[PDB]
Amino acid sequence: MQRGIVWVVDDDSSIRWVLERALAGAGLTCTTFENGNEVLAALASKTPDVLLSDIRMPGMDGLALLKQIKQRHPMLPVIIMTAHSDLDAAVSAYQQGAFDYLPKPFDIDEAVALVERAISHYQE
- The reply to whether omega before 105 is within 30° of 0 (cis) is yes
- β-pairing, 50-53 vs 79-80, is parallel
Rounded distance between C-alpha atoms, residue 107 and residue 47, angstroms:
26
Q: At 10, phi and psi to the nearest 5?
A: -115, 170
Rounded distance between C-alpha atoms, residue 47 and residue 16, angstroms:
19
Instruction: Tell me whether residue 64 is exposed, middle or buried, using C-beta atoms within 10 angstroms of its C-beta: 0 to 12, 13 to 18, 19 or more.
Output: middle
Experimental method: NMR
Rounded distance between C-alpha atoms, residue 92 and residue 52, angstroms:
18
Distances in Å between the Cα of 63 and the Cα atoms of 20, 67, 98, 107 are 21, 6, 11, 22
Q: Where are the domains of the chain?
A: 1-124
Instruction: Tell me whether residue 20 is exposed, middle or buried, using C-beta atoms within 10 angstroms of its C-beta: 0 to 12, 13 to 18, 19 or more.
Output: middle
- 52: Cα within 13 Å, side-chain hemisphere: 30
Contact in structure between 7 and 39 (CB atoms under 8 Å): yes
Three-state secondary structure string covering the chain? CCCCCEEEECCCHHHHHHHHHHHHCCCCCEEEECCHHHHHCCHHHHCCCEEEECCCCCCCCCHHHHHHHHHHCCCCCCEECCCCCCHHHHHHHCCCCCCCCCCCCCCHHHHHHHHHHHHHCCCC
CATH of domain 1-124: 3.40.50.2300
Contact in structure between 63 and 94 (CB atoms under 8 Å): yes
How many C-beta neighbours within 10 Å does residue 13 have?
11
